[PDB]
Design a protein around this ligand. Structure first.
Ligand code: TSL
Ligand code: TSL
Lengths: 265, 265, 265, 265
């Protein structure tokens, strides 16, 4: 019956909304277009960091990577600053999550190795976690601007929420590695107007945002009740019928998050 | 069906919940035990101030009232500080709303004059905005400790919400007087953990709290959506079965307010 | 020569300014009216918690203290909410520092025990730290309203700065207790517009504020440079010539703090 | 005096500092190597935009420019994305200021037309604002790597401050053109760690950064005191002697800006 409010929000914002909240021990699952495909955009950077963490020892984070000015091919607020000094795999992880750095994601994909510069390796890592649906085919920034209807560089709310649940709440990572991913998402800077804005302030929120053309605006998050119960909230949206240049509407994601918060209360 | 969530909240906190949100042009009215009597507690201090404002000129706020240490009969954080200097009606209004000062309320009641120390005048003022249900019979602090089932010093979420709607949104006061009430409720200090804690931070919240024995915890509020749509939210609660010494559960009001926010989004 | 910029601020704000920054290993001390007496106001609440910490085991923080409505004699944003339940010595500490709770401070003083409700015990604890100047003679809220010139309830910037240096940077407390005082001062809610507003955001700031009649506005703080060098900044002000009702000017303290920051850079 | 602190920061960071703050009605001018030549680096992109604005109508911002992958010759986070669609002068203005886009800068230079790809037309526009000293001779990225001592592609903190003063505070642009420049500088993404990091957060800061070889790091900024008084702060630094590969030290610029803030308080 909450699916009437979501469809009302889709009408209001001229957009398509996708919502998934995995069912917990006490409460039931929340689904709206939960098995419809939305574009990853930058949300893939969260399990990308987890893939590098799972495949390498903790001391692989101190390895220095250097890059040229020709590698800065997308918005890279941190990689742009360190073209002469270079950056370690740890700082690349910090940048790729907290500042959604495009270049940091592409080098992290390269560190994964393999065909397509690491896209195949990344999709393989998602498969190991049980995600049968998601797929990454391009690197930054081409992945953001796939045409609508094309299945490349897409996930689903259902699929991405279950990946995030294992990475933060489950056992996909050892505790010392799981605490680094969690801390990076807790100190994220790009999502203050989305799921964070939809939930009361005494609910803790860690998230990774995603934005691209065709009005694409995503936010995947883990949230904690004031009493400590954790939930996973996957919210994805696009406005593909409005064309390539359609503006994303962050208010839709905040409003949807407020609907969810009332149900989880 | 939001009525299931409220009765769930009643079972979880061992309490009786009363919720009223007046219907606006866009949304429908929210009701849960909306026409069941709850105790005013300190929520009456909001229409009390508006009563003094309505019956008097603005310069009546500069009238100085002196009192003795025998008049301090309830929680009076501000009145206790000025026993030798005295307080103006204006300060007595500020104290009674922002700090829920008990003695300032009793003096303001005396400023309404008449039988029962100005209770009869106050209920009469309540009949003028159209509220034939509510009634104030005692002064501070006795009004907080009436037995359950007794109809003295009681209002209802339905009754109190419509009063507040006229006083803040309607025309029960002139604009100059209407702004002083709202500024005192905006900078209130006693309700951070109730309705304010249940709504997202980009919603604006003005409120007057009430607390008393039998686990009585109330919060009456005017809220504003991030786009500026105002609503009235009346949340009242008691735990009479737990007896006279039952602890009030503020988390219940915060939780109920999050449910309301989800529907209003 | 920085004493010219301070006296210019004194002229601009119609106020008397006291500033002390203890000399560190590299840099020299900063003094302005550094051995002149200013009123403690609520800055005493910081070493008061330290005095309770020093005099008791860590499990004494779990002791439940109960109080009545007649103990609320000043602004007590937290103690006013827990009259029915009571508060633990830990919560009383947290409230007295973070919200500058007046009643919580008076109960902590009483926990020290002794003449004057524990004021003598407090003044003795300062003497043990090497403070020969300060004195606390009254309780809240009488200590904020002593006449000017009166030595009662007065410290000096020099004296209070060296007390705070021992309590946070020195060895006047064991590490497990010292981290509790530091964490309460780091999460203070009352001093965003004073020394915090005067220092750049990449400087860490812990503080305790003081405010009272005669335009009295103090802020005692420990700050950390972006590279980790700690400094102690004692800033006090009053406007006694402006009368009992003179308004404190927080802009003076933030401005004075910006002058100090330039010298410490 | 303040010039001893600057030379101390010089010793500590192994650099040569250049600081100019144009004197206002109230305060005196700040100078330190103010008429010594530093390399423009990317700070020229600030008056470059104003040049296009000044000699063109508002409709010229919608002119579309197309370019090849052979024109991408330096760090161009925005120009790399639009090689097949092309960018308009307006977007090229936005990119060249907010992301210090190199290829956007070179296209805007060519939009000024003339010898040296519009370097002569740019220096010419600088002479119209009274700047006899500054000169731009190369295009991106050759201008960032001129040897020390060489006078090509150099300004001075004195010479770069007054142009910016005219271009943001003065009448070098009509108001409708002046606000586009200001809004792009206000939303800059490349200078959080420099002058912005040295001033308290309740000061407003707009800036354009510059970075190049030989440890060159600049920041030209307009700041606003919390009460509204605007100033111009030109901070330039390099580390010749340390070599072509010397790393720029941003902490120097932030430290120098904190010294300026103390004087201006
Ligand atoms: C993750 O893939 C997204 C980046 N989105 C934004 C960004 O901050 O870079 C855009 C919209 C600017 S982008 O598609 O590069
Ligand atoms: C200590 O500095 C505290 C001030 N708190 C209040 C109090 O009850 O004392 C005030 C603000 C009313 S005061 O300045 O006395």
């Amino acid at each position: 019956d909450l699916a009437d409010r979501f469809a009302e929000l889709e009408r209001r914002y001229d957009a398509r909304l996708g919502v998934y909240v995995p069912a917990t021990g006490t409460t039931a699952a929340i689904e709206y277009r939960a098995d419809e495909r939305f574009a990853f955009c930058s949300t893939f950077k969260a399990p990308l960091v987890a893939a590098v963490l799972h495949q390498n020892p903790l001391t692989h984070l101190d390895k220095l990577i250097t890059y040229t000015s020709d590698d800065i091919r997308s918005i890279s607020p941190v990689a742009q600053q360190h073209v002469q000094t270079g950056m370690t795999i740890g700082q690349l992880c910090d940048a790729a999550i907290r500042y959604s750095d495009g270049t940091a994601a592409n080098l992290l994909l390269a560190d994964l190795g393999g065909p397509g510069g690491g896209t195949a390796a990344f999709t393989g890592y998602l498969r190991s976690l049980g995600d049968t649906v998601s797929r990454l085919d391009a690197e930054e920034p081409e992945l953001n601007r796939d045409p609508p209807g094309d299945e490349r560089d897409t996930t689903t709310p259902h699929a991405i929420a279950l990946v995030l649940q294992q990475l933060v709440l489950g056992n996909a990572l050892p505790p010392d590695k799981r605490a680094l991913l969690t801390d990076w998402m807790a100190r994220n800077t790009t999502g203050a107007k989305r799921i964070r804005a939809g939930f009361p302030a005494d609910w803790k929120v860690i998230d990774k945002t995603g934005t691209g053309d065709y009005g694409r605006a995503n936010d995947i998050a883990v949230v904690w009740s004031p009493t400590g119960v954790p939930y996973v909230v996957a919210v994805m949206s696009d406005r593909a019928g409005g064309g390539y240049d359609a503006e994303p509407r962050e208010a839709l994601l905040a409003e949807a998050a407020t609907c969810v918060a009332g149900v989880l209360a």
